[model samples]
Target: ESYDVVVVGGGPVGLATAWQVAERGHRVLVLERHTFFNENGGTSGAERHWRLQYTQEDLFRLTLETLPLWRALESRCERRLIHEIGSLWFGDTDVVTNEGQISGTAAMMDKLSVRYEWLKATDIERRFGFRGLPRDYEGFLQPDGGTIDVRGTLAALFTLAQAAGATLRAGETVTELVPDADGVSVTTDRGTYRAGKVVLACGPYTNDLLEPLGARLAYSVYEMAIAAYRQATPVTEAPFWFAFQQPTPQDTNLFYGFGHNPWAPGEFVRCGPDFEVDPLDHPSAATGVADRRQMDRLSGWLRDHLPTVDPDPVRTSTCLAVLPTDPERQFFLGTARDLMTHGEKLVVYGAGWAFKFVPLFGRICADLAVEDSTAYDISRLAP
Candidate 1:
């Protein structure tokens, strides 16, 4: 079948693109390699952080643009997708100093007029009831930032896209893409489909599909862990928290968590540290397993930092983070140079931070597919 646009992956970004294109009166089809909400997929998580505090100025502005779109999507779906519990970042005194790592983020927030509170260690302890925090440590809090219902939002996006005349097919893996002058032929295990434009939002699998077409995108796939624990107190009372500290020599200095929501089973609080592993070096490595070492470290950290929560996590899982090796950590979201030069049709995009900007990015993808350009300054993200 022929479509105005063919989305190569039915993840959050792809589904967002499908919805945007269909809303513009275009026939769009989305192909998913696995079933919707599959555990192995990158977007299969229950929740994701939504924040306005970013060290990068462009990303902060982009996030500002995305907030309204998220609201529009919520209104369209008639569902509350974002939990406005607020976000907090705590660290040692270095976080506020000129030479501190987060100083740039603090300055950016000030420049953007983002509302925040610079709290002392005592104030933080009094507000959040964290007795384990060091007396010398301090932090800042953003009242507008919180967590997004990733699973629910994806389902809502699916509904919105389907209502707008978008067709979604799950378990359809694309083997090859043959771009022609007028359109592109997408070959899959079931059959072949044609579209005037094709969008590649296949997360970690993007490079595999592009490689066969002589186009390569450098991505380092990392396994990210999440641990869930049954909290001793009500989870909703605790705001989302992030701590920047090197717990171990091998550990990343970043750790984040979300308060329990009713949607989570037993209202278990979720927490994890930011860690990365290169899939290239460990081809046979298993993902999604609770790494005992990391889990132990997390448990210890929780015991010291969040004494209200259970020290031992009841459950843990891993997720994939397809990150570009570029020092800037920007995404690639433009037409494939090889295909475009040959008068073919293809758009490719992938990044670890893509989920937060799914709605805006989807609109950008739609603009590219329909008009070959976008008003947003995506020059840095160009292929």
Candidate 2:
């Protein structure tokens, strides 16, 4: 009875959910376990590349759905968030990583009738400043993908949610969640609130709340590594790129990069590895450390390939990735309502390079919490 809904976590997913739910005239409470824009949050980063490449057709369709929504957000905030610098995907067609194989990505792109250019590895080197000699390696150049302003995105959503009468509190840790027929009782360390439904979009920390409810979803955690090299050329000289290479004996060979960031303009292009030195089973297990060995692998890659980048990293950081343990790495969305037998509603989202789809995710999770249904076909991803 205290509120219509309570959303845990203040990352893009939570803030986006608050914006929609509050706009719908529902009373909403958004609690962040850390301060707003904390470094540990999922959205904390220099930049993220938005792309339409996905192995699954459903997710590919979902990616398309977010573009219009992103446009609207830009207009409302009266500022640009997504920069269209294009995305280049290169390396072995069969090499698989979190984004799946290049062939698999092309297959879905074909299914959706999306257009992209096919380039040889030599073409990539000529255009993107790579020093490569692999006649067999191929690349996909998709035009609509590029860099997004990370802080600008979070600020706009926070402002919109606040304007819509939602209560967003910082530094509030949710220690317990108890559900009953009337609603769910969410107890933070500071106080307790009741709501008709709950959204557990707390990223990897989500299971800490759902574990006691006997509804823990499947996932894995990795302390992902990032390194930024000082650009020998202007950041605009490069397109956002992912190298889908066959794994070297010492590394996964799955690496990604983004062009210059608008938030912090400088002579730096941030690129990083998808593989973690040690995979964490939970967020609680994170050491908040970047592995030197992994950084060594990154340095080696830059030395051999990126002629336009200084091999020594000017900056480095580690991010926590919440991934699907399932083979296809499909997302988890919609309700886990069965987990609450006493009419206490629940919705969950397990993400991928989810930054691109934050706006659409906000709408989907909001619909699940307030309307108890959504128009999107999430049958396969439903919890």
Candidate 3:
């Protein structure tokens, strides 16, 4: 059957895109190589959290829109998925002195009219003292920020999309995209689809599929680990904290976002800042003693930061950061602002990293798909 749009990948981005397009009266089909929606599949899994803490102006606004969408989903799904965890963005001395990270963030927030609090080192120490923390660091708190159940959110989105009349083809892979003057024909291992437009929202596999079409990714892929923790006592109200600055030169930028609620029964406390790696291999593909070493390094960070809590994680998972090829960690949207495109069908790149803003992402991508630009000024996120 022919579709107005053929959306690739069933991850949050792809699913949200299909939902958005279908709701707009466009016929859509979503292709997923994996049959399940868990982390084990092409998605980030249930362990993922939705937190809106952005230094970029458009990203900040995008997150704000998703937050309310998340709230609406919580009611529709009949589940409590979002929690008011708040957010903090901190960096080394560079955050204050050279890059003006603090000032820039402040200016962006002020211009955007988002509420935030400037926090000095002493302020953090006063509120949440630490056994080992960097002295030269500054951060700001965005009260509107919080965490969402990645699994629940995805489940709700899937349900909502189906309810809204969108079709999802799980366990199916598209082997090729055959583009003609009228539309692109998507050839899968099982079946074929002729689509008016194809949304390339595939996750880590995006580069592999889009590369043939001459889509150059903006960021180098990096490895990130989210660690779980077992609380000694129930943490009913400790705010979610992420450490951006390391106290010593040897320290990796130790950033952790912890779930304040006590683990249920056998569950343990969890925290993560994501471990770094040079390649784009899946965590499941990782084999050998390297995994053990990564765990050890995570343990060391835990010991240094949360001496009061257990250092070992009961479970651990990895996610990728699609950072721009340039040193700056920005994303590529629509046609490459830096690269050349041979077609009028604008192909977007790098979106999986910003799952918290999926709803707004749909809005922005839809705008790009239709108008070649967005109503929201994304000059800051431009390449």
Candidate 4:
């Protein structure tokens, strides 16, 4: 049987795309490799950072477009998915100064008219009361940024899509996609299916399905980790904090997290380094094991920056990140060249930072699937 649109991968992006398509009165089907909310799924986490502090103007605008959409989804689902606790960025002076390709977050916020506060070391100490940070380290706090309940958001999207008459099938691993004059044939481990248009929103497993069609994108899949630590004081008013490091003898790039509400009562407040495994290594070799050395580094950093928080992490979990090597590091959203001659039957999209723009991405995917173009300025994201 066939449908108006078939989305491969039941992750946040795919589900959002399915919801958008179905909401427009088109029949849509979503296929997942694993069960919904499974550990293997990227959106299985308790929460994800949502912020408008982008170095690029387009991304900032895209995030703005998604803000109201997120609220709309919450209203439609009758549940709150975002906690507007705010966000804080500190550490390396270069990052704070807008010295590189990445813009100074505070400057971007100012240009975008997003409310923010510049923080000196004394201000940081007065506000957070943490210790051992560099006396000269400055930062910015943006009030609009916060954390998104990832699990809840996915659940809401699933509910919205299903309620819109979209079909969702879990554990249906797609193996091949054959684009033809009429549409595309999707072959799954369970069976084959057809769709007038196919949106390939698969995350790390994207290239696996695209390689066969000679439409593979340039990306590196890495195993990432997020550690949870118990806060001694249990502060309820902490913002999402990110402390970055400049290239040093110890490490090339390092970013550490500070806080997000715990998933369980008396559970650990999450803090960890955003480190990635070697991309050249086999995906199977990427075990979820927490590196003792990295953990030690995290502990030391926490000791210096957030002295009150316990240095020892209570637990850690594995996550996957698909980093696009494209110069722009933006999303890839367009029809495959091979299939373009026939029609815009195959639309592919995904980026490491796509979670924050699920709603906007869905709308853009729907536009590409139905109209072959989007009103949004995504020329740089053309595949």
Q: What is the C-alpha lDDT of each candidate?
A: 0.79, 0.82, 0.62, 0.74
Task: Name the candidate that leads on TM-score.
Answer: 2
Model 1 over residues 115-166: C-alpha lDDT tens digits?
Answer: 8999888887778757677677777888998889888888898999999999
lDDT of 4 by residue, 1-383 (tens): 79989999888888899999999999899999888777664554577888887877777887888789998988998877777777877766564221122235556777889888888878877787567777877777888788877878888888889999999999898998888888889899999888988998887777777767665677777666667877776564688877665655554356546365534366466766665435534345656775666677778777777865777778877677676665356567667754345436888885566778888888888888877788888777767
The better-scoring model by TM-score among 2 and 3 is 2
lDDT of 2 by residue, 1-383 (tens): 38898999999999999999999999999999888778785665768888877877777887888889999999999989999889888888887777777898887888789889998977888878888647788978999888988889999999999999999999899999887777788999999889898887888887787888876777777788788888875543578988887776766768888777755756688888887345676677766666788888888888888878888998788888877777565677777776556533877887566888889989999999998789887777765
Cα lDDT tens digits, model 3, 1-383, are: 88877777787777777777777777778888886474543355344455554556666667666777767767888987766666665556344221125556677778878788888777765655445556667777777656656777688779877877889988888887655567777889898888766777765566665667665464555555656766664443455666665334433445666555322345465676543345455333532222555567777877876564678676677655555555454555664434434344534546335666676666666555544667766665653
Model 3 TM-score (2 dp) = 0.84
lDDT of 1: 0.79
Candidate 1: count of backbone clashes, pairs at least 3 residues apart or interchain: 0
User: Model 4 lDDT vs. the true structure?
Assistant: 0.74
Off by over 4 Å in 2: 234-236, 248-251, 338-344
- Which residue segments of model 1 deviate by more than 4 Å? 92-101, 134-136, 234-237, 246-248, 262-265, 278-285, 338-340
Instruction: Supply candidate 3's per-residue lDDT for 377.
Output: 64
Best-to-worst order by lDDT is 2, 1, 4, 3
Error of 2 at 143 (Å): 0.9
Off by over 4 Å in 4: 95-103, 234-236, 262-264, 280-282, 338-343
TM-score ranking, best first: 2, 4, 1, 3
Query: Poorest 10 consecutive residues of model 2 by lDDT?
Result: 335-344
Question: What lDDT is obtained when candidate 2 is compared to the true structure?
Answer: 0.82
